Amino acid sequence: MRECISIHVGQAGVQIGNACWELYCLEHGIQPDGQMPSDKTIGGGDDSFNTFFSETGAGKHVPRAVFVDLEPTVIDEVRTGTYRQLFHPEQLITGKEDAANNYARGHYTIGKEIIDLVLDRIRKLADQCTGLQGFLVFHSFGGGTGSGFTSLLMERLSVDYGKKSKLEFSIYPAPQVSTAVVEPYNSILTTHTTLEHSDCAFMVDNEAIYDICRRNLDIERPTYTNLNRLISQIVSSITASLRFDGALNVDLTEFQTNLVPYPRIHFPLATYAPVISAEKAYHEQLSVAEITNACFEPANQMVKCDPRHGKYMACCLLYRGDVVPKDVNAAIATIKTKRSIQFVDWCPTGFKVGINYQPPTVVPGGDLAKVQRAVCMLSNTTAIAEAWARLDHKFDLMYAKRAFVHWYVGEGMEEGEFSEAREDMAALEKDYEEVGVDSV
Amino acid sequence: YVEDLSKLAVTSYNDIQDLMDSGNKARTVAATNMNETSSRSHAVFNIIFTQKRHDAETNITTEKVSKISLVDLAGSERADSTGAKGTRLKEGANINKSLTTLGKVISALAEMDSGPNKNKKKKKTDFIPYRDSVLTWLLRENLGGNSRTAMVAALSPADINYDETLSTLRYADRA
Amino acid sequence: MREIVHIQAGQCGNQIGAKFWEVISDEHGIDPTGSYHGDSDLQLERINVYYNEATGNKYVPRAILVDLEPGTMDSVRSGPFGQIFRPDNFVFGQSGAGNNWAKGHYTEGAELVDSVLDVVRKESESCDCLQGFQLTHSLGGGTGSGMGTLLISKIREEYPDRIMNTFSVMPSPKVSDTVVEPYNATLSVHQLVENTDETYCIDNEALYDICFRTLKLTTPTYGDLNHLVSATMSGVTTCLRFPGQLNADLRKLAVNMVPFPRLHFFMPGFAPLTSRGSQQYRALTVPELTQQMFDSKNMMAACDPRHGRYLTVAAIFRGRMSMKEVDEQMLNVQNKNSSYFVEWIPNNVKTAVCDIPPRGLKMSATFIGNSTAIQELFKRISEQFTAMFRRKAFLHWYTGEGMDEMEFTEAESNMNDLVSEYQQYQDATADE
Ligand SMILES: CC(=O)O[C@H]1C(=O)[C@@]2(C)[C@H]([C@H](OC(=O)c3ccccc3)[C@]3(O)C[C@H](OC(=O)[C@H](O)[C@@H](NC(=O)c4ccccc4)c4ccccc4)C(C)=C1C3(C)C)[C@]1(OC(C)=O)CO[C@@H]1C[C@@H]2O
Ligand SMILES: Nc1nc2c(ncn2[C@@H]2O[C@H](COP(=O)(O)OP(=O)(O)OP(=O)(O)O)[C@@H](O)[C@H]2O)c(=O)[nH]1
Ligand SMILES: Nc1nc2c(ncn2[C@@H]2O[C@H](COP(=O)(O)OP(=O)(O)O)[C@@H](O)[C@H]2O)c(=O)[nH]1
Ligand SMILES: [Mg+2]
Secondary structure: OOEEEEEEEHHHHHHHHHHHHHHHHHHHOOOOOOOOHHHHHHOOOOOOOOOOEEEOOOOOEEEOEEEEEOOOHHHHHHHOOOOOOOOOOOOOEOOOOOOOOOHHHHHHHOOOOOHHHHHHHHHHHHHHOOOEEEEEEEEEOOOHHHHHHHHHHHHHHHHHOOOOEEEEEEEOOOOOOOOOOOHHHHHHOOHHHHHHHOOEEEEEOHHHHHHHHHHOOOOOOOOHHHHHHHHHHHHHHHHHHHOOOOOEOOOHHHHHHOOOOOHHHOOOEEEEOOOOOHHHHOOOOOOHHHHHHHHOOHHHOOOOOOHHHOOEEEEEEEEEEOOOHHHHHHHHHHHHHOOOOOEOOOOOOOEEEEEEOOOOOOOOOOOOOOOOEEEEEEEEEOOHHHHHHHHHHHHHHHHOOOOOHHHHHOOOOOHHHHHHHHHHHHHHHHHOOOOOOOOO | OOOOOOOOOOOOHHHHHHHHHHHHHHOOEEOOOOOOOEEOOOEEEEEEEEEOOOOOOOOOOOOEEEEEEEEEOOOOOOHHHHOOOOHHHHHHHHHHHHHHHHHHHHHHHHHHHHHHHHOOOOOOOOOOOHHHOHHHHHOHHHHOOOOOOOOOOOOOOOHHHHHHHHHHHHHHHHO | OEEEEEEEEHHHHHHHHHHHHHHHHHHHOEOOOOOEOOOOOOOOOOHHHOEEEOOOOOEEEOEEEEEOOHHHHHHHHOOOOOOOOOHHHEEEOOOOOOOOHHHHHHHOHHHHHHHHHHHHHHHHHOOOEEEEEEEEEEOOOOHHHHHHHHHHHHHHHHOOOOEEEEEEEOOOOOOOOOOOHHHHHHHHHHHHOOOOOOEEEEOHHHHHHHHHHOOOOOOOOHHHHHHHHHHHHHHHOOOOOOOOOEOOOHHHHHHHHOOOOOOOEEEEEEEOOOOOOOOOOOOOOHHHHHHHHOOHHHOOOOOOHHHOOEEEEEEEEEEOOOHHHHHHHHHHHHHHOHHHEOOOOOOOEEEEEEOOOOOOOOEEEEEEEEEHHHHHHHHHHHHHHHHHHOOOOOHHHHHOOOOOHHHHHHHHHHHHHHHHHHHHHHOOOOOO
16 A cells, blocks of 8 residues: 655645645545545545545545644644644644744754654554555744754654655745745754755745746735645645556655665755646647746746756656657657756766656636646756855854854754754755766 | 852961862752763852051052952753753753853954954954853953953863864864 | 733833723723623634633733822723723832832832732733733833833743843933933833843834824824834734734744844834825835835834844734735845845844734734844933933932942943944944
8 A cells, every 4th residue: 555644844834734635635526524425426446545545434534644833823723724624633733832933942942742742643643554655744944843843853753764755845945035034044953854864855945936926827916825736736746656547657765766866965856847827728738848848947946046057967757647658758858959958977867757647636716727738847956056055155144143043052052053054064065066077 | 240249258278178168069060961960050269369568667558469260160061962851951051151152252352352453453442242141241350351361171082072172172272 | 822911010001001901902802891792703712812711701801000109090990991900900009109210129119019929920820821921111200110120120030931021111302201211211221131032112202203294193192102002012912813824923023133132122113104184095005014114204212223224123914915025025125225234134024924904904014123223212311311420410319218329330331331232233344
């Protein structure tokens, strides 16, 4: 049996989880109260697929999720909203104040006394699961909880389970716009967690998705709901292979194999090609070649980093809908023909291809148009280091004068740890070049 | 200064030794993984010495007055290796705060007494954050100004301690 | 469940607190008698931040009222919302301080502090998870300043881990109502810089300027000043009560606004303010709120931000609005006014958004700045202090109640050290 456990930490994680579970319930025909009319309507088949939902005796389907947050507000919204009857009552709120944009509060003092309960619930879910494949962890750098509690949870999960895959979907700080003054400290202090314990971490940027919404979907004033829906589409495209039939299916292990050249390099970028409005859905073929080319455009990247400044090291394409191998082979050949897209010398293979028959759905009240075909491209490239470098500069600008340090030091953290994280990050920045150099 | 501080008069080595023993007994000490007798509080030992020359014609009595200040600071801790929890953690946090500010002061002081001395002689304005902690406040005249000061750094030969040990040397290199 | 204990001291603090309890009580929908007569379901969801629940479906605000002259207490009881407060929290004595800080802090207040702390302990024991306190008082007065400082010291002695907020009304250059304001202000500021996490600066001159220039009122009274201040207090702590796209607890503001412990003197502001005549002309949107928040004439402290640099700022929006517009506007404010922000804090603008606006408005915003220009205010007080202390103008009143010159000298030195600590970061071009 194929199944993976979703964990959501912090406000960003919880809201992305709301969008994700809306999409999953719409995809599998599950009502908000957990019932499935399709079971009685058809009398056969398998619609409440076990990759995300567990079926009880009475026909109700409960999701395999663990929501965590130190604020009671964000999850109390869920507990009294449209989907209050869907989730299990165990929602794991800490009845106290929040991490307050502090790594120390979410990792040392207040992050504890809730970690044990979270691991107990995860243990129960794993015991229910048969042939568990991995964990999908949703969090956000910059926030105190999403950083510190994520570090605690990943450490304990690596100690306990070890061999199971662990994928992150995180919101990296943007180069220009941000919502806090102490973002660089929190983001830098997560390097150890995101490097040693995570097996493959996907990073997204708010500025990039704002630009995508403004240019493609013609939305002048997007809010976080659109961002969450796009990220949910990404995650659904990633995990579709475990649920529906396809000409070429790619599970999480074979997915990881063809994307991590080395252990310390598992930081790919993600892109969704046919992001297009309803009115612009007409006038365009939206063939395989068009979406494949649009996946490689610098303007459509989900993180503010230019692939033209680096070399592509691996690429994995995941197609949905009316797609046939002839067209994807032609598109791959055309992409290889172009000279702007530079591949490293030591990876002649280049591309991994997976195809799925189930086309992407459309959420009611959404913005993405209904399409016959879609593709999600995940690319391990060297350009991402540039983004890291920018953030590092900001950290230095705040550490030369020890601004805001006393807040971290007063909650158990030692000063030198700050310095330590920086060299660790520097080491990472030296490995994501020493690999891009042409061989001799 | 510290108001209502019991300044005891002493006359012989045995009496001050007894005072020392009582003071060391009275300190706050707790056990941690790093050390069985980890100190929990900074300590300052002050000796006020008066030197008098008596003459009925010309000389001046109370010729010299000096203050001898021996300071034992609780060291920085890391929660992972220390294994602290609850009160032992909170105490440590305060200790780290009282050290971090101190480091800044040392660094700040150094640059100023390096700058005006070497740069030109401008002496325009330089702020030293003495008031951010009571330790730095009480030792305002000791770290700089009207005293002669010595700094004794303690090192750990353990390889595992390297990333911490070097830090001490750096501040010592500035001291 | 986060919740706040509230303390009021002096005439100014008592009146501002009364007006504040009338404003918060509307938002949550509370009858003057104590019953609930709201319409929205989200008003009662987090009502326990301020109100204890009584037996008969009533709600009693968690307020403490302190004074030494009984008269103000009567003015609270014989008022529109006088019956809302429980009688046990009216703590008062006789023979008020008479604008003498020594009487408030040392002689008279030392007897009533025990009872006040008893009531505070009783309120705080019942708290499910006590977040912090907030005190309203005036620095330039008598009982207010002294008892506020004494209570702050005692509470920080007993509750070191909790937040300690403060809303202070300090002297002004032109508006003066007591001869001995500098002494009280200097001693109060000496007490506040040690024992407080956040301190919002309020000046009567700035509020009168806002009323005359922005709101175009002709005969403003203290009611309007209390209205503006109470709007600010309700704006500060919106996110504990109502849901939002991006919340902002008090600790988040404290962490993001305070770079070093002694620099926690904030300049507040509120938007929109439209005078009731121009309401039909302006469009209400996020750029308009952003333009009005950062306007110099809108500040409540009478210190021009153009004379210094913004160490940090925080913007708490209330209403249904897009996050992209907010982020773009804040970035534009940073970029265009490049010379009024410090060069070693990238993205020194905290942002918060709450989905429930005030009852009568579609959008609103609160601004909490932290800038070096505040030094000017302290400098002014220090100047006046010297002008009286060099000749010992009124010192016999203070020394007769059990003080000495040494406390005055150390308070002046501490104030000067704080003034020096702000300037450091004030000038541009950190190299030479
Ligand atoms: C829009 C409309 O038709 O009436 C508005 C109005 O005209 C304006 C001018 C109001 C009006 O404000 C004033 O006239 C005023 C006078 C002196 C001091 C302060 C305000 C208003 O009185 C104030 C009043 O404010 C509210 O109702 C808010 O909820 C406010 N609560 C109270 O004022 C209040 C007072 C006593 C008892 C219960 C509630 C509030 C503000 C911030 C945070 C929480 C609550 C409102 C919307 C208006 C009038 C009535 C004209 C303004 O004030 C506020 C705070 O909204 C002035 O700047 C705004 C802009 C508004 O457009
Ligand atoms: N894309 C996206 N980003 C979000 C969303 N909500 C918050 N963020 C980002 O998350 C960052 C900090 O928020 P969080 O990490 O969620 O903070 P937290 O998890 O609530 O933890 P605390 O700091 O203790 O409150 C902000 O800078 C935002 O940019 C969201 O809904 N979508
Ligand atoms: N904003 C505002 N300020 C006030 C009010 N009443 C008094 N003040 C200010 O408070 C100062 C007098 O302090 P006071 O209240 O007498 O202090 P107390 O004697 O200790 O209670 C004056 O300078 C006034 O500017 C009020 O209702 N609103
Ligand atoms: Mg939060």
